[PDB]
């Protein structure tokens, strides 16, 4: 069918997030200024950044210089945990918008659940900036299922997505099931599992069958799942074009089950003490 070879957007409780995004996590400012313009030319329309990454300024510059109308880009940033108290929260959002050279972001996330600031205060501030017209959609990041349920319950506005580490080596069964019940999506980071993916023999085998790399296989395995969005880090023009070409093909049912078997109890890469929650077991 005509639309099955094209990138989809993912219904994310009303947010419609493009299934593949340009993630600026792990990217320097200079890397962003070089590569993001090319990404946008090539056809990327979802850009993901955060206060803590320190590259919002360059994201803003790159988008502005691209000549892509603002309304055509889906732009996400994240509130850093140091900015969680109400007044710091509101101020940090205005500051992000100055760096991003726009009056609104499409999506604003709480970056991590771990904080002394009450959840309802953070969720309250998310809703405030949404109502102010500074944020179109609100969401969360690295929340466990208990916190997802709590966020959905406390928030007047729907929670669009939970952005979490997700790759073949980390099982997200419980998180996905909760997301789908609550109507939110899951946004994946670390699809490549810090280099494990290109070295995986099973993924290279499946990739071979389709004329695709192990990397494209992992990206496809994510993007082929219902309600899953994937962020890619492309620090060179070559990975850029490769990562984008994942709507060409589909994995068989058996290929999907096999990639799912790669999950390991020690597969999680990102686990900062204090910020990370008690992950679902």
Rounded Cα distance between 198 and 195, Å, is 6
Annotated binding residue 137? no
Angle at CA of residue 40, ends 62 and 4, nearest 5°: 155
Of the residues 2, 53, 84, 166, which is catalytic? 53
Instruction: Note the maximum CA span of the chain.
Output: 54
- Rounded to 10 deg, the angle between the 86-100 and 119-131 helix axes is 40
Asked if residues 87 and 117 have their Cβ atoms less than 8 Å apart, the reply is no
Taken in order 173, 179, 183, 187, the sign of the CA dihedral is negative
Q: According to the entry, how was the structure determined?
A: X-ray
Q: Between the CA of residue 219 and those of 127, 164, 191, 231, what are the distances in Å? A: 32, 15, 6, 9
Give 132's contacts (C-beta < 8 A, 6+ positions apart): none
Distance of CA 202 to the CA centre of its chain: 25
Annotated resolution, angstroms: 2.0
Asked if residues 183 and 222 have their Cβ atoms less than 8 Å apart, the reply is no
Catalytic residue flag (residue 53): yes
Question: Residue 92 corresponds to which tokens in the numbers above?
Answer: 């940090």
The residue written with tokens 């395995």 in the block is 221
Question: Residue 186 corresponds to which tokens in the numbers above?
Answer: 């899951």
- Other Cβ atoms less than 10 A from the Cβ of 10: the count is 23
CATH 3.20.20.100 correct for 1-281 = yes
Question: Residue 182 corresponds to which tokens in the numbers above?
Answer: 């609550």
Rounded Cα distance between 49 and 67, Å, is 20
Rounded Cα distance between 154 and 157, Å, is 9
DSSP 150-162: HHHHH-SSPEEEE
Nearest Cα neighbor of 231 from 171, 174, 280, 186 is 186
Distance of CA 76 to the CA centre of its chain: 8
Rounded Cα distance between 19 and 185, Å, is 10
């Amino acid at each position: 069918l005509y639309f099955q070879s094209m990138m989809h957007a993912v219904s994310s409780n009303g947010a419609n997030i493009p299934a593949l995004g340009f993630g600026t996590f792990r990217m320097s400012g200079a890397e962003v200024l070089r590569i993001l313009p090319q990404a946008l030319k090539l056809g990327f329309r979802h850009v993901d950044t955060a206060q803590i990454y320190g590259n919002e300024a360059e994201v803003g510059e790159a988008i502005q210089k691209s000549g892509i109308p603002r309304a055509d880009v889906f732009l996400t940033t994240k509130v850093w945990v140091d900015n969680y108290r109400h007044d710091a929260f509101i101020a940090s959002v205005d500051e992000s918008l100055r760096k991003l050279r726009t009056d609104h972001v499409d999506l604003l996330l709480l970056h991590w659940p771990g904080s002394d600031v009450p959840m309802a205060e953070r969720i309250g501030a998310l809703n405030e900036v949404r109502n102010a017209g500074k944020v179109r959609h609100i969401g969360i990041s690295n929340f466990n299922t208990t916190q997802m349920e709590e966020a959905a319950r406390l928030s007047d506005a729907p929670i669009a997505t939970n952005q979490v580490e997700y790759h073949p080596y980390l099982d997200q069964t419980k998180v996905l099931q909760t997301a789908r019940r609550l109507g939110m999506s899951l946004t994946s980071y670390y699809a490549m599992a810090n280099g494990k993916v290109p070295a995986d023999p099973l993924l290279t085998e499946i990739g071979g069958r389709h004329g695709k790399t192990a990397a494209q296989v992992a990206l496809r395995w994510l993007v082929q799942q219902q309600d899953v969005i994937v962020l890619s880090k492309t620090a060179t023009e070559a990975r850029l074009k490769e990562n984008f070409a994942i709507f060409d093909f589909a994995l068989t049912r058996e290929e999907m089950a096999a990639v799912r078997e790669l999950a390991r109890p020690n597969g999680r890469i990102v686990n900062p003490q204090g910020l990370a929650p008690e992950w679902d077991a």
